[PDB]
Design a protein around this ligand. Structure first.
Ligand code: HEM
Ligand code: HEM
Ligand SMILES: Cc1cc(N)nc(CCc2cncc(CCc3cc(C)nc(N)c3)c2)c1
Ligand SMILES: Cc1cc(N)nc(CCc2cncc(CCc3cc(C)nc(N)c3)c2)c1
Ligand SMILES: C[C@H](O)[C@H](O)[C@H]1CNc2nc(N)[nH]c(=O)c2N1
Ligand SMILES: C[C@H](O)[C@H](O)[C@H]1CNc2nc(N)[nH]c(=O)c2N1
Ligand SMILES: [Zn+2]
Lengths: 405, 404
């Protein structure tokens, strides 16, 4: 009967309708002719104002003051600001709300049961690259909390008309260098070849390891980016070992504790925050499956399977599956032993199912990208595999933005 | 306009131009994507144009596009629709249509085999009885003593004046599921409803976890009839593990032949409501979904306990360990019984080759990422990293409502 997407869980036979998708003001890549849902990158005053009015309504709804004189006065204040300057500015509590709502709105994130618990650092007074460094360092210390990780975001000044952006050039606050070798191969993380190359061009003295922590390249408006080395005591790392396979420790593998995205745009009511790094804690499959096993990343699957003495000559020995499970167990075990927050793909997906149910009650649906929510190993072993999902763009949002170079 | 399609492992890019040939809307809109939904929510002129398009596709395929044989076949079809409201396919067109429907099937990872398909014309079938004989010959043929051969059997098309020929079973071979006094199911929990129907239409039911179901076959406007498949026609494979001796003692088994029998085959406007097809299993179907899904045989915990794993916490990854052993047991057992099977690494590698063949041949390949990517070890296969466009081309297989 309902004129909204029916959504089914094929494990439990249960049914919901997504009414929240009606709140979407922005088109994705799909059409009735063809589905483009698996694509990683989907291809003035009037416009800003309507987006602003909409965000302010969302704000006043959330504090249950919708229709009030405080609501109408804020609306009038927002338009009067746009009337004289072309832009406007958020109140502190509006920014806190917008930031949380952007995380809550992110279809690709499985960790959203935590959305209401986000420390928002307001860094809109920041006026130099040096100050950005200070702010970022404070973020890392706060977020890392000696292993007891805490979600946080730091928000730098918003994009301004005819004035350069605040930009963090790194895609993450903590990433390993990738050194292009004389024989075409790569030492370190092949994902990070360009940023490593760019850091060196900008005066970094590079190391020669597989796990060299990259420095930050930070850009303040209309200035060239400046280079900043993170003090090693600030960057918590976990040496990797396996609970039963004694040789795994001898591989000298390690990963950083803090996953912190530094290259996304945070959009709130039309306003664009080009520098706004955020951090959580890892799901173990991100490190153990993607980072360590992708053929275009550290690519350690064969090495590990050779040590495990598997038949790597034939696919049907399932050497890849076996090695990947051990690497994942080793990631989980090492983080546990070191007392660094981590969550396995089972607990995370179970917690995402709970989140789905909370959002069904609270908002009548939850935008979710199936291909990204299902983990890269043991897919159908998790409850999210059997759960249908509707994907749409709500604002506030994190958006991908082109590399600044 | 034309979507850019990228492989994120290799950095390679293609453009899908095939998608402009779609005549049938899918479930997505610019406002929201519904591509993860399993099942989302004719007058002369309209059949005539699907008919012409299909005949055009066929003469193009044999490089006689524009010949007199092509002209006269278009005239035949028009003449037949214009007087009867419908028409009939020549066997050769049927053969071409069946293969093309498989080619066009976005959820199928086995499409590298698309050109190699045995097609049995069963359109001269007039009774549940005759249906049974055809199904039995299909099975004998497809099974081929473990050396599996892809096959389809096509029963008489839908006609406006009457009910459909239908196979009630969703697959030709499936295991009974008996709902038990204490709320649990013996056998396959996915087959409870179809098992109950078989009993209501007079089957004496077994009581094991692996009792092969009888077929319920329906000729137009007649009650469905029951037929037991002769035990010797149903090749089954007992499951053992290469290294774990106690696995054999789980008493696990599975049948060789995956044969879909509830799907509708659409060719050139015509609809074939009963058109069962089969190939061979990819091991993750049995090892992961059939045995490990919690609403199926759900054996994960039993296996994990046999392996003496810590079941008390998710972080020991006991589910992932056991699943892999279960999948390995399936591959080993099929190889030992000399029954055709393919693992998900081999299958996805061959699907990648298929995408490249179709790019050159047709300028695209419709594909449903969520179905192509295996249910375990997704990103360890190359399809994970491949962007895919999904859309409906005809000829096509379609879902249809259960006949009851
Ligand atoms: C608390 C623990 C958290 C967990 C376990 C988690 C988990 C994940 C995972 C597994 C992904 C996909 C990663 C990939 O495959 O590359 C992801 C993506 C994402 N996460 Fe979360 N996250 C957490 C916290 C956060 C926070 C605090 C934010 C923002 C405030 C956030 C926002 C996002 C966004 C925007 C994406 C998509 C990014 C992109 O498309 O590149 N997450 N998250
Ligand atoms: C030759 C060996 C074949 C292999 C290894 C194979 C593999 C697969 C797999 C793994 C699936 C998804 C199954 C699931 O998750 O339920 C599938 C679906 C499908 N296959 Fe293939 N297949 C083969 C042959 C065929 C043939 C001969 C046809 C038709 C002539 C066909 C048509 C289809 C269709 C229409 C689907 C979608 C089924 C649905 O929506 O329920 N396949 N195949
Ligand atoms: C806060 C947070 C927590 C967590 N557990 N994981 C993440 C993911 C970080 C991450 C790491 N590596 C890669 C990506 C994807 C980057 C990315 C790349 C492209 C091309 N498009 C996008 N939309 C996104 C994200 C973030
Ligand atoms: C020809 C062929 C070869 C092969 N290896 N596997 C198959 C899979 C058969 C198969 C088994 N169990 C379940 C399904 C899906 C059934 C199914 C169920 C529903 C509700 N909607 C759908 N679209 C499909 C298909 C077919
Ligand atoms: C082509 C495909 O969309 C792409 O590889 C996606 C699939 N799902 C993913 N899911 C997550 N969480 N992270 C990813 O990087 C990807 N990659
Ligand atoms: C909800 C989700 O789309 C559904 O569980 C799909 C996911 N991918 C699948 N892929 C295959 N091959 N077979 C399936 O049954 C499913 N199930
Ligand atoms: Zn879509």
């Amino acid at each position: 009967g309902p004129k909204f997407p029916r959504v089914k869980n094929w494990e439990l036979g249960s049914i919901t309708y997504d009414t929240l998708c009606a709140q979407s003001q922005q088109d994705g890549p799909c059409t009735p002719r063809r589905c483009l849902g698996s694509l990683v990158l989907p291809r003035p005053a009037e416009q800003l104002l309507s987006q602003a009015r909409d965000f302010i309504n969302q704000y006043y709804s959330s504090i249950k003051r919708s229709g009030s004189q405080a609501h109408e006065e804020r609306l009038q204040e927002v338009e009067a600001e746009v009337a004289s300057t072309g832009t406007y500015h958020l109140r502190e509590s509006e920014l806190v709300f917008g930031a949380k709502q952007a995380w809550r709105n992110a279809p690709r994130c499985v960790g959203r049961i935590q959305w209401g618990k986000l420390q928002v650092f307001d860094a809109r007074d920041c006026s130099s690259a040096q100050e950005m460094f200070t702010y970022i360092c404070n973020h890392i210390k706060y977020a890392t909390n000696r292993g007891n990780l805490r979600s946080a975001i730091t928000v730098f000044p918003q994009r301004a008309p005819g004035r350069g952006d605040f930009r963090i050039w790194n895609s993450q606050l903590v990433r390993y260098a990738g050194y292009r070798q004389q024989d075409g191969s790569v030492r370190g993380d092949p994902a990070n070849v360009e940023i490593t190359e760019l850091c060196i061009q900008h005066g970094w003295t590079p190391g020669n390891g597989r796990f060299d922590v990259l420095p930050l390249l930070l850009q303040a408006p209309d200035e060239a980016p400046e280079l900043f080395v993170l003090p090693p005591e600030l960057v918590l790392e976990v040496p990797l070992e396996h609970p039963t396979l004694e040789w795994f420790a001898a591989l000298g593998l390690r990963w950083y504790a803090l996953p912190a995205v530094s290259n996304m745009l945070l959009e709130i009511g039309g306003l664009e925050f080009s520098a706004a790094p955020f951090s959580g804690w890892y799901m173990s499959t991100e490190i153990g499956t993607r980072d360590l096993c992708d053929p275009h990343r550290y690519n350690i699957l064969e090495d590990v399977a050779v040590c495990m003495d598997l038949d790597t000559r034939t696919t049907s020995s399932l050497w890849k599956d076996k090695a990947a499970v051990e690497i994942n167990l080793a990631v989980l075990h090492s983080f546990q032993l070191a007392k660094v927050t981590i969550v396995d793909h089972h607990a995370a997906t179970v917690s995402f199912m709970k989140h789905l149910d909370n959002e069904q009650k609270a908002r009548g649906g939850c935008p979710a990208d199936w291909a990204w929510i299902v983990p890269p190993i043991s897919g159908s072993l998790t409850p999210v595999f059997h759960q249908e999902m509707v994907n749409y763009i709500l604002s506030p949002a994190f958006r991908y933005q082109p590399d600044p170079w």
